[PDB]
Amino acid sequence: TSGSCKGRCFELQEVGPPDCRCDNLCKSYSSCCHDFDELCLKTARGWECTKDRCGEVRNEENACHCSEDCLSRGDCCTNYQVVCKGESHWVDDDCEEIKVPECPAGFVRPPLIIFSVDGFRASYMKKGSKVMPNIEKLRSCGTHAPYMRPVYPTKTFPNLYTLATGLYPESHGIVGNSMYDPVFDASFHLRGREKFNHRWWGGQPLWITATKQGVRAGTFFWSVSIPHERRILTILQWLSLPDNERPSVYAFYSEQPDFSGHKYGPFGPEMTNPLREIDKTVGQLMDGLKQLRLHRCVNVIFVGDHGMEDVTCDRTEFLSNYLTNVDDITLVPGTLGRIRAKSINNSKYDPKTIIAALTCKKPDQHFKPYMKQHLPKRLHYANNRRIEDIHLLVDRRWHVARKPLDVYKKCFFQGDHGFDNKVNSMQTVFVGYGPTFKYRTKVPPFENIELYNVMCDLLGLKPAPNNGTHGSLNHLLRTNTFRPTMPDEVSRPNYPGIMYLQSEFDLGCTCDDKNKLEELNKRLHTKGSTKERHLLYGRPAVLYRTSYDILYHTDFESGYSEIFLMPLWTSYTISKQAEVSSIPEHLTNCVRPDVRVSPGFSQNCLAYKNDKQMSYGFLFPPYLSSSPEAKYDAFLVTNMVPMYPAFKRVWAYFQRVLVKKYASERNGVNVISGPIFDYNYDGLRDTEDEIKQYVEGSSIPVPTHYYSIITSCLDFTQPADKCDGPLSVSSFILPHRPDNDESCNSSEDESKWVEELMKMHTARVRDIEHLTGLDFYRKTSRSYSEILTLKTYLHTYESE
Numbered sequence: 001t002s003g004s005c006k007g008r009c010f011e012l013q014e015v016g017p018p019d020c021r022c023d024n025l026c027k028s029y030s031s032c033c034h035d036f037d038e039l040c041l042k043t044a045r046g047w048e049c050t051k052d053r054c055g056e057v058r059n060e061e062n063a064c065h066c067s068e069d070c071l072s073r074g075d076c077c078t079n080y081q082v083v084c085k086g087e088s089h090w091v092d093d094d095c096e097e098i099k100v101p102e103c104p105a106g107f108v109r110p111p112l113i114i115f116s117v118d119g120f121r122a123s124y125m126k127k128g129s130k131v132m133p134n135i136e137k138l139r140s141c142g143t144h145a146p147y148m149r150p151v152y153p154t155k156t157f158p159n160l161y162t163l164a165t166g167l168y169p170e171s172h173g174i175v176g177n178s179m180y181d182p183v184f185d186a187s188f189h190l191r192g193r194e195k196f197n198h199r200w201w202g203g204q205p206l207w208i209t210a211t212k213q214g215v216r217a218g219t220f221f222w223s224v225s226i227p228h229e230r231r232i233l234t235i236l237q238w239l240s241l242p243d244n245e246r247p248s249v250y251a252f253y254s255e256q257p258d259f260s261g262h263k264y265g266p267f268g269p270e271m272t273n274p275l276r277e278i279d280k281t282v283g284q285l286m287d288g289l290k291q292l293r294l295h296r297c298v299n300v301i302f303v304g305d306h307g308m309e310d311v312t313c314d315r316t317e318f319l320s321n322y323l324t325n326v327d328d329i330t331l332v333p334g335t336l337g338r339i340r341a342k343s344i345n346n347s348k349y350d351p352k353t354i355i356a357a358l359t360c361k362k363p364d365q366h367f368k369p370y371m372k373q374h375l376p377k378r379l380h381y382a383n384n385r386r387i388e389d390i391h392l393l394v395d396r397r398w399h400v401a402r403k404p405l406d407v408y409k410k411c412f413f414q415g416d417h418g419f420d421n422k423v424n425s426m427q428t429v430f431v432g433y434g435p436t437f438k439y440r441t442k443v444p445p446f447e448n449i450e451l452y453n454v455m456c457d458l459l460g461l462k463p464a465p466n467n468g469t470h471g472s473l474n475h476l477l478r479t480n481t482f483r484p485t486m487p488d489e490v491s492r493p494n495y496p497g498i499m500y501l502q503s504e505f506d507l508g509c510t511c512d513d514k515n516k517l518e519e520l521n522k523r524l525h526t527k528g529s530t531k532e533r534h535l536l537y538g539r540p541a542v543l544y545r546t547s548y549d550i551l552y553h554t555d556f557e558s559g560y561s562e563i564f565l566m567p568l569w570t571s572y573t574i575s576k577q578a579e580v581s582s583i584p585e586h587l588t589n590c591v592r593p594d595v596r597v598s599p600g601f602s603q604n605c606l607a608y609k610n611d612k613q614m615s616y617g618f619l620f621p622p623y624l625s626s627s628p629e630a631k632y633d634a635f636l637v638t639n640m641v642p643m644y645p646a647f648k649r650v651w652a653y654f655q656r657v658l659v660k661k662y663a664s665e666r667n668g669v670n671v672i673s674g675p676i677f678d679y680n681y682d683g684l685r686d687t688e689d690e691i692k693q694y695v696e697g698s699s700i701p702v703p704t705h706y707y708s709i710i711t712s713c714l715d716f717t718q719p720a721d722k723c724d725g726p727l728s729v730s731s732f733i734l735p736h737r738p739d740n741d742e743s744c745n746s747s748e749d750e751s752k753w754v755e756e757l758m759k760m761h762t763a764r765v766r767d768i769e770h771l772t773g774l775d776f777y778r779k780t781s782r783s784y785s786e787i788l789t790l791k792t793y794l795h796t797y798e799s800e
């Protein structure tokens with residue numbers, strides 16, 4: 001702190017102790033030079049010019065200047081030209097399409113300014129629009145989504161760092177605002193020094209991606225005591241540096257409206273002022289850009305990290321009300337819960353019994369416990385040693401705490417966030433404005449994991465490997481689009497014919513089964529004659545090395561795995577007209593050998609008989625067969641999959657009731673169903689040596705999940721099989737569980753709980769692609785980028 005900040009204010013390259021720092025983060029480290037405050041955080045005379053301040057003689061003690069040299073120097077007050085040159089405020093100008101970057105000579109690319117606002121709930125765009133005129137102009141003149149989905153948990157650090165890396169928290173490492181890493185034996189907290197250590201922070205964030213590729217970055221982080229006006233002026237000043245020193249990417253962060261929303265609730269009357277203040281800050285940025293003639297050159301992103309919900313202390317569930325042993329557990333509390341043993345020397349500690357004591361115990365229980373691998377796959381919240389094996393998903397509006405003492409010894413607060421990222425109130429904002437963004441364009445909602453890629457595109461950078469689907473946000477952009485090619489199929493299928501006699505099959509299976517017109521008929525169905533009906537978008541590509549067969553049938557086509565002894569995928573189309581029939585009595589326990597598939601690559605009924613826990617189901621539902629004759633195909637051993645009796649309740653209702661219901665509402669649907677194996681809960685397809693469970697005494701592996709992809713025409717006046725334009729999709733990844741403990745109402749009728757469980761396990765097609773190594777929608781007439789957008793769509797089942 002002995003050295004000086006003279007001419008070093010907000011140095012871009014930080015310096016090494018014990019030499020004092022003048023970087024915008026030095027306050028946060030107590031390493032600022034003695035004179036930092038006087039030299040770098042000047043405030044003299046305020047933030048604005050007045051009439052009398054114009055053409056003044058430069059006074060270095062001022063906050064910002066109104067002299068005439070200031071423009072070259074880059075440090076005029078942001079309203080200088082308005083008060084001293086008759087100019088108008090950016091907000092008061094009509095918008096004009098920005099067809100090309102209109103940049104000063106010397107700029108090699110449009111700079112990018114990322115303006116992030118903590119806790120900026122998506123509905124503030126509509127509800128606060130009267131008091132945010134600069135933000136409303138960006139929104140209605142630029143590209144905007146009605147909202148942007150955060151990642152889970154909907155906390156500040158996990159979301160800011162996803163924005164920076166394009167990674168799910170489980171991959172980047174910042175899986176909460178608070179963490180314990182058992183390998184380091186260290187804790188990460190909001191307050192304190194451990195969070196600065198580099199070993200917490202995985203992946204490659206944008207500022208490191210920029211630097212490694214020759215693009216210079218302004219520093220993204222700001223000490224909370226540097227006032228917002230000083231942050232804006234600093235960025236404007238950096239933008240005035242000579243070509244060889246001037247950064248190309250900048251970030252401003254605002255602590256508002258999050259700070260106030262915690263105290264007052266998302267819509268407390270006190271919330272108007274922070275919203276005005278954010279707007280005025282945007283105003284200043286745009287005014288300042290306009291003076292430097294940079295307001296049609298720079299791309300501006302206005303983005304939130306998460307929204308904000310109404311939460312008060314009277315809405316707290318206490319674990320002490322459920323557990324006798326509360327003192328043998330550590331709880332990461334609040335809008336999510338993570339539980340571990342207080343002491344790893346405690347050999348009596350048992351997650352199963354803790355879960356059981358936490359499961360459906362009160363009529364209106366406001367949290368639900370999970371082993372982390374049983375959490376909905378759409379949250380991608382398991383594959384990190386910093387995520388405790390026991391997780392509590394907390395109802396929106398609620399807290400979970402260990403004991404009452406914690407709450408009144410640590411009603412103050414009215415707002416909080418952290419809940420499931422599908423929750424409406426957690427949704428945040430996205431606006432893009434600039435030469436590279438589209439003009440007056442609304443785009444559909446998307447996930448924040450997608451932005452890193454887009455920010456790399458806006459700067460001409462190659463993104464590090466990440467969880468975005470690169471190309472899925474091309475429709476936000478006027479140019480710099482990224483044009484990916486479909487992945488190459490790695491394995492080609494066999495097309496087996498009839499090669500085996502009934503009597504070669506010793507499977508312990510039985511079935512009650514027993515004309516030249518109709519015989520040529522049947523053979524063609526087996527040759528793939530109706531495949532254009534049931535495979536509407538082409539067969540999926542297998543993206544890994546395996547042996548598999550395509551099997552055709554009247555009512556469905558499948559890609560049958562010789563390794564896993566079941567289909568990887570089964571595909572079928574159900575028209576609006578289609579009729580549900582029931583399984584005939586003579587066929588209730590019917591399983592038939594498939595004369596195209598070797599007994600050695602087939603399942604067997606004995607294994608299921610022997611396995612007291614495991615039963616079986618069918619991927620193509622016998623209920624939906626087009627004729628009594630076609631129904632025999634649905635009972636083929638190659639259409640069969642292992643299912644727990646508890647899960648059969650779910651599956652049967654989906655197949656007997658819901659598929660037809662969706663076909664009614666959507667004017668026909670195409671369905672692709674199959675098994676998922678994710679025993680190590682990494683969100684990726686298991687190889688065969690990773691499978692932890694098999695049907696008793698056989699090589700039949702047991703899936704962890706079952707998926708379905710349900711596709712139809714976006715224009716529902718066209719039938720699914722005759723669709724001329726964009727598609728509509730919803731999908732699910734259902735956990736394959738031996739009980740229905742997840743659904744508190746499961747002893748009632750399937751119609752009261754099944755559809756709710758499915759909504760909870762809604763999925764993107766892209767989630768199913770990672771989990772299966774398949775690539776879907778290979779043959780459509782749609783552009784590939786549009787297909788990528790479709791694959792990343794998540795049907796949320798939240799109201800308007």
Ligand SMILES: *[C@@H]1O[C@H](CO)[C@@H](O[C@@H]2O[C@H](CO)[C@@H](O[C@@H]3O[C@H](CO[C@H]4O[C@H](CO)[C@@H](O)[C@H](O[C@H]5O[C@H](CO)[C@@H](O)[C@H](O)[C@@H]5O[C@H]5O[C@H](CO)[C@@H](O)[C@H](O)[C@@H]5O)[C@@H]4O)[C@@H](O)[C@H](O[C@H]4O[C@H](CO)[C@@H](O)[C@H](O)[C@@H]4O[C@H]4O[C@H](CO)[C@@H](O)[C@H](O)[C@@H]4O)[C@@H]3O)[C@H](O)[C@H]2NC(C)=O)[C@H](O)[C@H]1NC(C)=O
Pocket residue numbers: 167168170171172173199200201202203380383384385465466467682683684770
């Ligand atoms: C979302 O996108 C991300 C980014 O693409 C995807 O994550 C990738 O998944 C890959 C496949 O699982 C994974 O590949 C592995 O790389 C290993 C090398 O890892 C280091 O180097 C990379 C590159 O710089 C670095 O990114 C890694 O950083 C991780 O770990 C550090 C330090 O621990 C953390 O700071 C950081 O946050 C990150 O942690 C995350 O990833 C790891 C897995 O790497 C998780 O376990 C953590 O929980 C956390 O999520 C690393 O520093 C390499 O060792 C692996 O190779 C093994 O398997 C292959 C098979 O090809 C084999 O050839 C090798 O020999 C090796 O096997 C040997 O080791 C095995 C394990 O020790 C052992 O069992 C065997 O017996 C063998 O001896 C593997 O290729 C890649 O690292 C991550 N990247 C990131 C950033 O997470 C992610 O999958 C996407 N998610 C979805 C759902 O799509």
Ligand SMILES: O=C(CCc1c[nH]c(=O)o1)N1C[C@H]2CCN(C(=O)c3cc(OCC4CCOCC4)nc(C4CC4)c3)CC[C@H]2C1
Pocket residue numbers: 114116155156157160161163164177190206220221222223224251253255258303
């Ligand atoms: O005070 C708080 C949070 C308190 C709080 C309330 N609710 C909650 O969850 O946390 N903080 C005090 C600190 C305030 C200053 N911060 C940063 O400079 C910053 C910005 C930032 O941008 C990343 C860009 C990436 C590109 O796209 C736009 C965002 N990435 C970080 C971390 C992740 C590297 C920190 C905010 C975080 C701190 C957190």
Ligand SMILES: [Ca+2]
Pocket residue numbers: 677678679680681682683684685686
């Ligand atoms: Ca896996």
Ligand SMILES: [Cl-]
Pocket residue numbers: 153155175176177178332
């Ligand atoms: Cl947390």
Ligand SMILES: [K+]
Pocket residue numbers: 608609610611612613614615
């Ligand atoms: K059985």
Ligand code: NA
Pocket residue numbers: 459460461
């Ligand atoms: Na480039």
Ligand code: NA
Pocket residue numbers: 740741742743744745746747
């Ligand atoms: Na139940």
Ligand SMILES: [Zn+2]
Pocket residue numbers: 119156258259262417
């Ligand atoms: Zn907050």
